[PDB]
Enzyme design. Structure first.
Site, PDB file in Angstrom:
ATOM      1  CB  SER A 130      -1.030  -0.023   1.099  1.00 13.41           C
ATOM      2  OG  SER A 130      -2.073   0.896   0.818  1.00 13.41           O
ATOM      3  CG  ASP A 176      -6.838  -2.855  -3.273  1.00 17.57           C
ATOM      4  OD1 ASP A 176      -7.469  -2.141  -2.476  1.00 17.57           O
ATOM      5  OD2 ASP A 176      -5.621  -3.069  -3.200  1.00 17.57           O
ATOM      6  CG  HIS A 208      -5.679  -2.693   0.466  1.00 17.58           C
ATOM      7  ND1 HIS A 208      -4.979  -2.166  -0.591  1.00 17.58           N
ATOM      8  CD2 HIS A 208      -5.160  -2.142   1.579  1.00 17.58           C
ATOM      9  CE1 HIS A 208      -4.085  -1.320  -0.147  1.00 17.58           C
ATOM     10  NE2 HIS A 208      -4.178  -1.288   1.176  1.00 17.58           N
TER      11      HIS A 208
END
Length: 258
Positions: A130, A176, A208
């Site tokens: 991320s 995601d 995610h």
């Protein structure tokens, strides 16, 4: 011929293994000992008979700690790498800051008493989840010497990565909703230079947080990418070129031959 080749010839099973052929030990860098990062754990092969190894720094995402990316440490290190999983100075650090901390963690290894003799300081790579993946891209964009960059479900407000000269594997998650591939992963890949050795892999049905627990597909292709580009190991190009057929992969792009 290639002096950086480590370990026996690979197979799909060898790169899917939870532990590769190298036994792994670990050392802790305390927050106080860490300058430019919030500390971390260094995983390294105990076998020094085959020579030095490339170094990999891994960053967690926003508000997350090393625990979210810990499994990658010894899984990758057991394939023949010195890996530092890092904590950030603050949990609120933004992607560009995380990139500076990934570089600081790689540079810490140069003078770390436990691993300085085990690393080839000229062969280093960055990975992250991320915001930590946006950090890996930012670190590569700010250091042309890095050998590999692997953003996992990367998140960044910057979509233009024209300055990256480091082989980059962009790993996206199909479903995601936090860092959607269309606005993040794919946009990052699409802005990498057209002559760059690069690849895009979308994980089928993945959310995610797929990178927060063991994912064989993430591990096998991260290992193949780091071998092919940190070690120049041509023995691992077979898993990236031609395109693989894992059902766990929903989309794939690669600039083969590398």
């Amino acid at each position: 011929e290639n002096p950086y080749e480590r370990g026996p010839d690979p197979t799909e099973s060898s790169i899917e293994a939870v532990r590769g052929p190298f036994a792994v030990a670990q050392t802790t860098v305390s927050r106080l000992q860490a300058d430019g990062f919030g500390g971390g754990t260094i995983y390294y092969p105990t076998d020094t008979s085959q020579g030095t190894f490339g170094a990999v720094a891994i960053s967690p995402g926003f508000t997350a700690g090393q625990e979210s990316i810990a499994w990658l440490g010894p899984r990758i290190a057991s394939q023949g790498f010195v890996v530092i999983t890092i904590d950030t100075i603050t949990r609120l650090d933004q992607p560009d800051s995380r990139g500076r901390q990934l570089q600081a963690a790689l540079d810490h290894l140069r003078t770390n008493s436990v691993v300085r003799n085990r690393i080839d300081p000229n062969r280093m790579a960055v990975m992250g989840h991320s915001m930590g993946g946006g950090g890996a891209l930012s670190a590569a964009a700010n250091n042309t010497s890095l050998e590999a960059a692997i953003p996992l479900q990367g998140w960044h407000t910057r979509k233009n990565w024209s300055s990256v000269r480091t082989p980059t594997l962009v790993v996206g998650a199909q479903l995601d909703t936090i860092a959607p591939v269309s606005s993040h992963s794919e946009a990052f890949y699409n802005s990498l230079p057209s002559d760059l050795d690069k690849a895009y892999m979308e994980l089928r049905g993945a959310s995610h947080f797929v990178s927060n627990t063991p994912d064989t597909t993430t591990a096998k292709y991260s290992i193949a990418w780091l071998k092919r580009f940190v070690d120049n190991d041509l023995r691992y190009e077979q898993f990236l070129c031609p395109a693989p057929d894992d059902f766990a992969i929903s989309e794939y792009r690669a600039t083969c031959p590398f």
